[PDB]
Each structure stands twice: as C-alpha cells, then as structure tokens.
Design a protein around this ligand. Structure first.
Ligand SMILES: Nc1nc2c(ncn2[C@@H]2O[C@@H]3COP(=O)(O)O[C@H]4[C@@H](O)[C@H](n5cnc6c(=O)[nH]c(N)nc65)O[C@@H]4COP(=O)(O)O[C@H]3[C@H]2O)c(=O)[nH]1
Ligand SMILES: Nc1nc2c(ncn2[C@@H]2O[C@@H]3COP(=O)(O)O[C@H]4[C@@H](O)[C@H](n5cnc6c(=O)[nH]c(N)nc65)O[C@@H]4COP(=O)(O)O[C@H]3[C@H]2O)c(=O)[nH]1
Ligand SMILES: Nc1ncnc2c1ncn2[C@@H]1O[C@@H]2COP(=O)(O)OP(=O)(O)OC[C@H]3O[C@@H](O[C@@H]1[C@@H]2O)[C@H](O)[C@@H]3O
Ligand SMILES: Nc1ncnc2c1ncn2[C@@H]1O[C@@H]2COP(=O)(O)OP(=O)(O)OC[C@H]3O[C@@H](O[C@@H]1[C@@H]2O)[C@H](O)[C@@H]3O
Lengths: 103, 103, 104, 104
C-alpha cells in the first residue's frame, strides 16, 4: 500500500509497479537505465535514432571517440494490449494516489 | 536533499516546493485542493467551465441539488514569468531527481 | 479520424474530444479557459488555492485591485468514474495516435 | 509560427522542433521510431532493459522465437545541458502554444 514516491523508489531499484485504480488490467511500469554513449556510436551504429538527430550530433559534437552523450533513465509501461510504451508519464491521479503495488 | 516522493508528500501537506536543477529560476509547484461541486453550481455557477461541459453535465446528471461531481486535486506551477500554470506535469528528470527543496 | 493536433484545435474551440483506443469508456477531455485574476481576490477570496500560495502572493504583490495574475488555460478529463481530473496529461500514445474523435 | 499539432506532424516525419518560449536554450525534441522485437532478443540480447522486465517476458511470452513485442515510438529531448532526455513531456503550455519552430 504505497504512495507514488515509494513506487518511484521501488522503480529506481529495478522493480515492476502498478496502481490498483488503473482502468487497463495487467499493466505495470518499469525503469530503463541511463547510459552514456560514444558520439560516433550514435552517428553510425544506432538504429533507433532519427537521421536528423544524428546529423545534429555530427554537426555540434563530431566524431571524437572520447566524446560521449548521456541518455537519461526513464519510465516505460507494459500497456493493456501488451505493447511497451516508452516514456510513461504520471497523471495527476497516479501522482497523488496511494494504491501503488509491487508487481 | 529531497526526492520527488518527499516533495509530493510535502505538497499534500500544503507546502511549496521546487527543483534546483530547473532551467527557469524562481519557480515552484503547489497543489490545488480537491472539492466536490453540485451539478447546479456546475451548469449555472462556474465561469471556468466550457459550455460543452455544462451541457454535457446538464444532459446527464440533471437538476438534482444533491448530485455532486468531484473535481480532483492537482498540481500547479508559479512559472518563471510569474504566470500560474494549472496542471503542472512531472517530467522524467523531475521524477527521478533528488534535488527537490521546500519553498 | 483525427490526429492529436486536430483534436487540440477542436479543444481550443470549446469541444469535447476522446480517443477510441482508451481503456476506460465514456471519457473525454475539454479545455478550461484562461483568466486574469485580481491579486486581492486570490489572497482574500479564492477558496480553491492553498495558503502557502496566498502567502507568497501577498509578499510578492500587494493588493491594489489593478494587479492581476494570469491563470493559464488547461486540459481536463471526465474520467471513467465520472470525476473531473484537472490537469490532464497527454501520453506518448495520446500524442501520436490518429484515433481522436469529437464527443457531444 | 506553429501549433503543437503541426510540430507533431513534423516530428512524425523525422524533424527536430522546439518552442520559442522555453526557458532553457538550445533544446529540441525528436521522435524515436517504433520497432517490433522478438521475445528472445529481449530476454537474451537487449541490455537496456531491467532484469525484472526480461524475466516477465520470459515467463509470459515464453521461449519461442515466434513471439514479438512492439515498442512504441516516443518523444525525446535534447536538454539544455546536452543530455538526451528519453520520454519528453508536453506541458499544458507546450500543447496550447503556437510558438513552435522547426530547428532541423
Ligand atoms: N481560469 C481560472 N479561473 C480561476 C482559477 N481559480 C480561480 N478562478 C476564478 O476564481 C473564481 C472563484 O474561485 P473559488 O473561490 O475557488 O470558487 C470556485 C471553486 O470553489 C469551485 N471550483 C470550480 N472548479 C474547481 C476545481 O477544479 N477545484 C476546486 N477545488 N474548486 C473548483 O467553483 C467556484 C466557482 O468557480 P468559477 O465560477 O469559475 O469562479 C472562479 C474563477 O472565476 C484557476 O485556476 N483558473
Ligand atoms: N525501436 C526500439 N528498439 C529498441 C528499444 N529497446 C531496445 N531496442 C532494440 O534492441 C537493440 C539492442 O538494444 P540494447 O541491447 O539496449 O543496445 C542499445 C543500447 O545499449 C544503446 N542505446 C541507444 N539509445 C539508448 C537509450 O536511450 N538508453 C539506453 N540505456 N541505451 C541506449 O544503444 C544500443 C544500440 O541501439 P540500437 O541500435 O537501437 O539497438 C537496439 C534496438 O535494436 C526501444 O525502446 N525501441
Ligand atoms: N498506451 C499508453 N501509453 C501511455 N500511457 C498509458 C497508456 N495506457 C495507459 N497509460 C497510462 O497509465 C495510467 C492509467 O492507465 P489507464 O487507467 O488504463 O488509462 P486509460 O483509461 O487508457 O486513460 C488514458 C489516460 O491515462 C493517462 O496515461 C495513463 C495513466 O497514467 C493519459 O493521461 C491518458 O490520456
Ligand atoms: N510554463 C510552464 N508550464 C508548464 N510546465 C513548465 C513551464 N515552465 C517549466 N515547466 C516545467 O518545469 C519543469 C522544469 O522547468 P524548466 O527547466 O524551466 O523547463 P524548460 O527549460 O522551460 O523546458 C520545458 C520542458 O520541461 C518540461 O516542463 C517543465 C519541467 O517539468 C516539459 O517537458 C517541457 O517541454
């Protein structure tokens, strides 16, 4: 029986959480961790980034091996249809509710 | 310092809080309390409701004085230019940060 | 058959909208208009604001009846249980979907 | 001179956009594409997923190569400090503003 703050602390430590009051059933959220990536790994090896961004990186940072760019950790959801939503966001209700549970 | 969860519990108790790492300076968030409002007061009293809502409420809930609709608590922000942003939303960075302070 | 951008334009013009793909049924969103409010009203007469805020306003702006503070427009939801959630949030799915429809 | 809806259409088409009225400077948002990934890859190959999720996938989608899971597209922000914020959020101000601009 938890607040959003305890759910967040639980997420930071790599757990799965959910709210009883959600409309969809069988969902949970989780954290994806932070990582620092070499810039030329971004420009040349990463499939999941748009070309526009890769071009901007090349333009403003370049191909130095030393240079690395940090990707922040963030929340994701296993939604009701079984898809993974990157970037889960907390509604006002999620934030002030106290019906969070560990899954 | 403080996590977002402690900031949330602190907001539930009516305090103003803010993050050091925010781009704009001099800001803070606070909570607007929850309230239950009569359908009469909704259809006929409130300036801040669109007609479409007032009409939806009329065609549904009706004239009963007893009928009430709960308007929920929610977060608001005193922004850098001094405007009050209703319905402040927490970014991923905000949620995972531990640089919250009581204001 | 609308995008989120078209749905937002409908909202700005005072309509109710919804996504077919939402889990909860019978929900919709609407926009609550912006307003400029007198500093005195906020500090002395507004029931829905917390005291910490009323105290901050008083220190920051004295009440002259000409000093006004702007409260922004924002989106709200009639939720599945019939309560009104102020401050509705658009999920990544909400934002990228094209299953928006107008509700009456 | 753009609404959030136009900025979103531009994002879905691979452009970088930003708001004039943001406090931080030099920031922009972009979309990360959706992809469908086989279960076996998720459990055994992807490192940027927590172990509890990989286990859930193993327990639920099984050991099959047949099963695939869809990872949705989503918005990301290049922040004022040059870090890439995954899962960028549209504030009430963002969604109702008409000061969006294409940056690349
Ligand atoms: N745009 C905007 N205007 C604001 C805001 N806060 C206050 N106002 C204005 O201040 C008036 C009086 O506010 P009140 O004393 O809280 O008196 C309010 C309040 O007690 C109640 N009410 C309406 N919606 C809500 C809500 O979401 N939450 C709560 N707690 N009360 C609400 O209805 C009463 C009458 O509402 P109105 O006729 O609209 O009259 C409102 C509206 O003209 C705001 O954040 N944005
Ligand atoms: N569309 C999509 N595909 C996904 C997603 N999660 C995993 N994948 C796929 O799984 C591949 C391997 O992921 P990885 O082992 O984490 O290997 C990744 C990961 O180590 C890293 N990476 C890139 N962006 C990020 C990020 O934002 N955060 C983290 N933590 N790592 C990232 O770069 C490596 C190579 O990236 P890719 O070439 O994209 O290669 C990714 C992409 O093929 C997702 O949410 N969406
Ligand atoms: N596919 C998806 N992508 C991103 N987020 C998703 C999602 N499915 C569920 N969520 C989120 O998970 C919590 C409740 O889940 P639900 O109660 O099942 O939500 P739903 O009834 O569909 O309403 C939807 C409304 O809820 C809000 O986001 C919810 C909310 O934080 C958001 O404001 C949306 O407009
Ligand atoms: N007028 C306003 N109305 C609503 N919310 C506002 C706001 N001013 C600031 N915020 C929010 O407050 C926190 C940090 O504040 P900032 O660091 O000043 O953010 P900013 O650089 O303006 O970028 C803006 C980006 O940050 C995120 O919203 C921020 C973020 O939650 C969101 O993703 C947006 O795209």
């Amino acid at each position: 029986s938890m607040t959003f703050g305890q759910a967040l602390e639980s997420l930071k430590r790599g757990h799965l959480v959910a709210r009883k009051g959600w409309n969809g059933k069988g969902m949970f959220i989780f954290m994806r961790p932070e990582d620092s990536l070499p810039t030329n790994m971004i420009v040349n090896q990463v499939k999941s980034l748009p070309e526009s961004f890769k071009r901007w990186v090349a333009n403003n940072h370049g191909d130095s091996e030393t240079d690395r760019i940090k990707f922040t950790a963030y929340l994701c959801m296993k939604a009701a249809d079984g898809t993974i939503v990157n970037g889960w966001l907390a509604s006002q209700t999620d934030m002030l509710a106290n019906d969070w549970v560990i899954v």
